[PDB]
């Protein structure tokens with residue numbers, strides 16, 4: 709069995725650079741399956757699609773493999789100054805057009821990109837898990853702020869529409885960050901409020917697996933242990 713990971717610098721090998729790392733690098737130790745980390749820094753649901761990276765997973769995924777998809781950090785902003793990452797606003801079948809990189813691009817909503825990827829994989833027999841984005845440092849200001857982005861609820865919506873599994877990685881990470889406290893969580897964010905140090909990436913991976921165990925996600929079948937701190941939500 710293979711587990712394919714799709715996401716951004718919060719998941720990817722080498723993180724956002726400068727000594728940071730992504731949570732996907734800490735998962736294989738806890739799974740009896742092979743992990744393929746196809747996350748890449750800087751990507752959004754839009755740009756991951758445009759670059760053919762969902763298609764590349766589709767080519768190689770087979771029945772019974774898992775695909776975990778987690779976007780949101782790079783999906784906001786303004787199409788008026790199109791950075792190639794921002795999705796069209798909305799939750800459904802809305803379309804936006806913008807010239808980017810020499811093309812008048814057709815741009816979908818965040819849920820539509822995820823639903824489309826999910827359909828591709830599901831029709832081949834893969835088990836798709838959509839996961840909400842991780843939080844930026846919720847202790848940046850010295851007290852704890854739980855401020856989910858719109859992309860958290862959008863991932864849940866996309867899973868419901870596509871008929872696949874949802875894991876609320878956001879909430880499980882923010883729950884453990886609240887309990888770890890100001891000093892420790894700030895130490896996970898060495899250069900900015902997004903990219904985690906190796907210790908933080910490990911915590912973030914553990915929180916994904918806590919969510920899986922607590923929610924009963926299908927991936928539980930390949931987990932090697934359930935010994936993770938925190939509580940079920």
Ligand SMILES: *[C@@H]1O[C@H](CO)[C@@H](O[C@@H]2O[C@H](CO)[C@@H](O[C@@H]3O[C@H](CO[C@H]4O[C@H](CO[C@H]5O[C@H](CO)[C@@H](O)[C@H](O)[C@@H]5O)[C@@H](O)[C@H](O[C@H]5O[C@H](CO)[C@@H](O)[C@H](O)[C@@H]5O)[C@@H]4O)[C@@H](O)[C@H](O)[C@@H]3O)[C@H](O)[C@H]2NC(C)=O)[C@H](O)[C@H]1NC(C)=O
Pocket residue numbers: 849850851890891894
């Ligand atoms: C929540 O946890 C926080 C993190 O643990 C904790 O904040 C830390 O508190 C300790 C104790 O007071 C401070 O340690 C003291 O630091 C001063 C020197 O401080 C100044 O220099 C540091 C280092 O600057 C260099 O490195 C950083 C990081 O790479 C660069 O950004 C920077 O450009 C330099 O190269 C700097 O981090 C400090 O900055 C904080 O403070 C200034 C205002 O004073 C803010 O403007 C800034 O946003 C930031 O908050 C500061 O410029 C040293 O003289 C002492 O001996 C002692 O070592 C840590 O500085 C402080 N760290 C941070 C990240 O804040 C919070 O207190 C805690 N919050 C709550 C409400 O409890």
Ligand SMILES: *[C@@H]1O[C@H](CO)[C@@H](O)[C@H](O)[C@H]1NC(C)=O
Pocket residue numbers: 805806807812813
């Ligand atoms: C981009 O394509 C759309 C769809 O055909 C069109 O409405 C829009 O005018 C095009 N944009 C540019 C700036 O011409």
